[PDB]
Amino acid sequence: PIMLLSGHEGEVYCCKFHPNGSTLASAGFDRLILLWNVYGDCDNYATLKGHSGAVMELHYNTDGSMLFSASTDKTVAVWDSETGERVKRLKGHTSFVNSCYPARRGPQLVCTGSDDGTVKLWDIRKKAAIQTFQNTYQVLAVTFNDTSDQIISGGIDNDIKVWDLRQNKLTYTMRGHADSVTGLSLSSEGSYLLSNAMDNTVRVWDVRPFAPKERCVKIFQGNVHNFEKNLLRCSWSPDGSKIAAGSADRFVYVWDTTSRRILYKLPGHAGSINEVAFHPDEPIIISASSDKRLYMGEI
Amino acid sequence: EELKKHEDSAIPRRLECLKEDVQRQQEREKELQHRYADLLLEK
Amino acid sequence: VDALPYFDQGVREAAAALVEEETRRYTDIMRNEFERLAARQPIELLSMKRYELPAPSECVNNSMAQLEHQAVRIENLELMSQHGCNAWKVYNENLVHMIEHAQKELQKLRKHIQDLNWQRKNMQLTAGSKLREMESNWVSLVSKNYEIERTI
Amino acid sequence: LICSISNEVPEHPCVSPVSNHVYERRLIEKYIAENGTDPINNQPLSEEQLIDIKVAHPIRPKPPSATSIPAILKALQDEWDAVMLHSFTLRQQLQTTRQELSHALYQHDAACRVIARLTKEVTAAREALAT
Amino acid sequence: ELSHALYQHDAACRVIARLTKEVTAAREALATL
């Protein structure tokens, strides 16, 4: 089956799948975070309330107990996935929080970026910023490597930047986007980082202790951005074999991580697509878009 | 018929060996970086 | 145990020598007696070579034998000619039903033989890729571990 | 169409109900008295368990040169020649299969020792590159 | 038994051909290093 989900009154910007594949989380412009049953009759249970701005990005921690939510109200909330109670508010950035990531494995860490041009490292136990990286241009997307040593940030400067937690220096610069980067994501192996950008280029970059030194490992095409200037996010399949990235042309694009052939171009959406997610066990795709509906495609 | 049954078992054993052979290779890769990473600490 | 036939397109004489070097290191009665003796010796037991030759002027018996068998012969050729070719071509039809059944089994075996090989082919191509993936990763470490040490 | 014992084309075929296979009555009747079980499947089978089958009968055209004379002399001689020299040659074929069996299993076990010897060799050579 | 052996013998024989060439590659690699 396909399965069509509806309920969000406004644009859906992000959706994720619980690490154990039992539930979905979704949120957008409404300001509500909805939880869904992946199986059964695809029912909706708890609604998380308390964000005053729109929800720009959701993530689960690796355990699926904590759900992180960057909002436009400058606050990043930490949510209990079990009860739906709010845990903490990371008040800190002076402007909109565009995105956030939670470090897997290591002691609890959270990274954020915002329109104030800074990137901040948070320890959820301190109620204060740990480190600050002033960039100079607004920051749109940010992710940790698997070792929790490096911060990867994508902004409007067309240059993905890598930060060293110990040195606090600009370690790496990646050139190869011609325009703003709207969405970043690490492979489950730590091996590769996936990027979307206005230039309509999906680029994979490889991050390793020993690097070729010009890490434009692969380039994919199909994915269109337009006058809506929506943030666009991309995801890796659980096994790193497939790449999905949303577009503004109503199609979900899925590519073969090797041959780079388009495996799927999927319709059903009426408007622009903001995020595509893969179920952690089975070939199921959750596609979230601005038309306020979700699809559960099965491959 | 026989070639199918004896072969099908041999491949898991072929792969599983190379799988564990790969796991050990990853460890040497995983440490050698850290010594390079510690070059920046002395600076 | 594992040796991919379909995938390995690229030694038999070499491997034969190594296998050769490990090899350098390591109910019937009387019937059966006369039958095995006849086959071993390569001699068939002689029959009655008497009835055909004989001679005019013991031979009174041999003569009277030739008559009764000749009358039985001429009666044995009468009942054959009465039916004639109808009895022969009726058996010829049976032989065509017997033949076609064998070649149907030739096909059934042909299909299941190619069907078993067809399943093997996919397995060979599945793993041969996975082995290719492993070797690429193997060579990457091999040089990665070096380039880490060179800089240290 | 044939019998599953002698390799005949049966004159009175009879089918067993434990294993669907047609035998000629005389040859299946002999097996049950020797040891009361089905020859192919080795399942319990008796003479009453058998079921006679019917067909349009089999016809052999007795040759044009058919008399008591060739049938006694030439034809019967050839039949006991053909029985004798075949089973002797078949006993020769069974003897070589057992000899060629021994050359197969020895060469097989010889290969097993090479693999076991090379399995210790390869991984330790790969390990030495890792070290 | 004859057929299954001869097939599996020459099949197991190809294990050696593969094994020998890899073993050989490990020697010059380590030797030259």
Q: Using the 8-state DSSP alphabet, how is residue D44 labeled?
A: B
Domain ranges for chain C: 1-152
Residue A195 identity: S
Number of domains composing chain A: 1
Query: CB-CB: which of B33, B40, B41 is closest to A209?
Result: B33
Q: Which residue of B has its CA nearest to C126?
A: B11
D and B interact (at least 3 Cβ pairs within 8 A): yes
The alpha-carbon gap from B42 to the nearest alpha carbon of chain A, in Å, equals 11
Rg (CA), chain D: 27
| Contact in structure between A187 and A143 (CB atoms under 8 Å) | no
Residue E9: name the closest of D100, B12, C127 by CA. Answer: D100
| Contact in structure between D61 and C88 (CB atoms under 8 Å) | yes
Q: Using the 8-state DSSP alphabet, how is residue A105 labeled?
A: S
**Contact E20/B at CB under 8 A:** no
Domain with A206 in it: 1-299
Residues of C numbered 19-48 whose beta carbons fall under 8 angstroms of chain E's beta carbons: which are they?
A: 19
**Contact C18/E at CB under 8 A:** yes
| Contact in structure between A293 and A273 (CB atoms under 8 Å) | no
Resolution of this model in Å is 5.1
Distance CA A136, CA A284 (A): 39
Phi-psi region of D79 (alpha: psi -120 to 50; beta: other; left: phi over 0): alpha
Burial degree of C108 (CB within 10 A; 0-12, 13-18, 19+): exposed
**Experimental technique behind these coordinates:** cryo-EM
Give the CA diameter of chain B: 66
C-alpha triplet A195, A197, A199: angle, nearest 5°: 135
- Cα four-point dihedral sign D41, D46, D52, D57: positive
- Identify all chain C residues contacting B32, using CB atoms and an 8 Å cutoff: 144-145, 148-149
Q: Is A73 helix (H, G, I), strand (E, B) or coil?
A: coil
Distance CA A12, CA A54 (A): 10
Tokens at C24, concatenated:
């350098």
The string of DSSP letters for A202-243 reads EEEEE--SS--SS---EEE------TT-----EEE-TTSSEE
| Contact in structure between A42 and A34 (CB atoms under 8 Å) | no
Touching subunits for chain A (3+ Cβ pairs under 8 A): B, C
Burial degree of D11 (CB within 10 A; 0-12, 13-18, 19+): exposed
Tokens at A143, concatenated:
């992710």
The CATH number for A298's domain is 2.130.10.10
Q: How many residues does chain C have?
A: 152
The string of DSSP letters for E1-33 reads -HHHHHHHHHHHHHHHHHHHHHHHHHHHHHHH-
Q: Which residues contact A192 (CB under 8 A, 6 or more apart)?
A: A186, A204, A205, A206, A207, A217, A236, A240
Q: State the virtual CA torsion across C43, C48, C52, C55 in degrees, nearest 10.
A: 120
- Identify all chain B residues contacting E8, using CB atoms and an 8 Å cutoff: 2-3, 6
A and C interact (at least 3 Cβ pairs within 8 A): yes
Q: Is D51 helix (H, G, I), strand (E, B) or coil?
A: strand
Distance CA E21, CA C11 (A): 10
Q: Is A127 helix (H, G, I), strand (E, B) or coil?
A: coil
Residue A223: name the closest of A188, A283, A268, A181 by CA. Answer: A181
Q: Which residue of A has its CA nearest to C144?
A: A210
Q: Using the 8-state DSSP alphabet, how is residue A39 labeled?
A: S
